[PDB]
């Protein structure tokens, strides 16, 4: 997260770290058994680490749980990173407590101008902000006009832009799969951009509100 601040510990209790030897993507807990992340973060087995604030230190709040199933959206397209959403089923349920709580799925799509929070352990591009401690950033959803103007003809219905066209504040490598939460609902999943925090290149996010049918049917398919 570039241009953000260290989150109050456990203020984002749905945030998880996906780990296969090192942190490489984030995710969000949506109930005891399932995590939402980005399809390009797919690995056949991942360890999900919950209740984290500083990922390089054991703090006593953590739960490390192996995945039993990792399910990409059937229509994910790696060429253009379209339908970039994935479900991860935990091999055992998470214990919900002060450190670990699920985030609600969206009741409807959030309109442009809504202020949201994005968080993660990715690159901060700063000697002052430590990426091992969870970073937080408040970003507004941008209009489709602004989003398509920044990335001509690259924005599909499964995508939205959020951030600041002036640059300086953005998500970045290592934040993929993590949450964009707006008024208590998961509206986006960190997905792609050109560089990080560059002027005219805001972050692009998977649009969770058009996937509620696939997410809720798959979370009860097996």
């Amino acid at each position: 997260i570039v241009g953000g601040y260290e989150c109050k510990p456990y203020s984002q209790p749905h945030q998880v770290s996906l780990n296969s030897g090192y942190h490489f993507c984030g995710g969000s807990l949506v109930n005891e058994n399932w995590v939402v992340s980005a399809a390009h973060c797919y690995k056949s087995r991942v360890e999900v680490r919950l209740g984290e604030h500083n990922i390089k230190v054991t703090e006593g709040s953590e739960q490390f749980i192996s995945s039993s199933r990792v399910i990409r959206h059937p229509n994910y397209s790696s060429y253009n990173i379209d339908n970039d959403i994935m479900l991860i089923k935990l091999s055992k349920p998470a214990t919900l407590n002060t450190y670990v709580q699920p985030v609600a799925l969206p009741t409807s799509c959030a309109p442009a101008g809504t202020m949201c929070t994005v968080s993660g352990w990715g690159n901060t591009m700063s000697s002052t902000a430590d990426s091992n401690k969870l970073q937080c950033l408040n970003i507004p959803i941008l209009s489709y006009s602004d989003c398509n103007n920044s990335y001509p003809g690259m924005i599909t219905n499964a995508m939205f832009c959020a951030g600041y066209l002036e640059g300086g504040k953005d998500s970045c490598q290592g934040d993929s799969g993590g949450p964009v939460v707006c008024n208590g609902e998961l509206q986006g999943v960190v997905s792609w951009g050109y560089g990080c925090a560059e002027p005219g290149n805001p972050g692009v996010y998977a649009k969770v509100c058009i996937f509620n049918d696939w997410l809720t049917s798959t979370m009860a398919s097996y």
């Binding site: 980005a38 970039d84 970045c172 490598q173 050109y194 972050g203």
Partner: peptide
């Protein structure tokens, strides 16, 4: 260029996804 925000170690550009390149620091971006 279109570059997903995953943390991925690399040596050369071809190790990276989409239009990400392997930046000097040994990671895609």
């Amino acid at each position: 260029r279109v570059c997903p925000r995953i943390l991925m170690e690399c040596k050369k550009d071809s190790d990276c996804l989409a239009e990400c390149v392997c930046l000097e620091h040994g990671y895609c971006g």
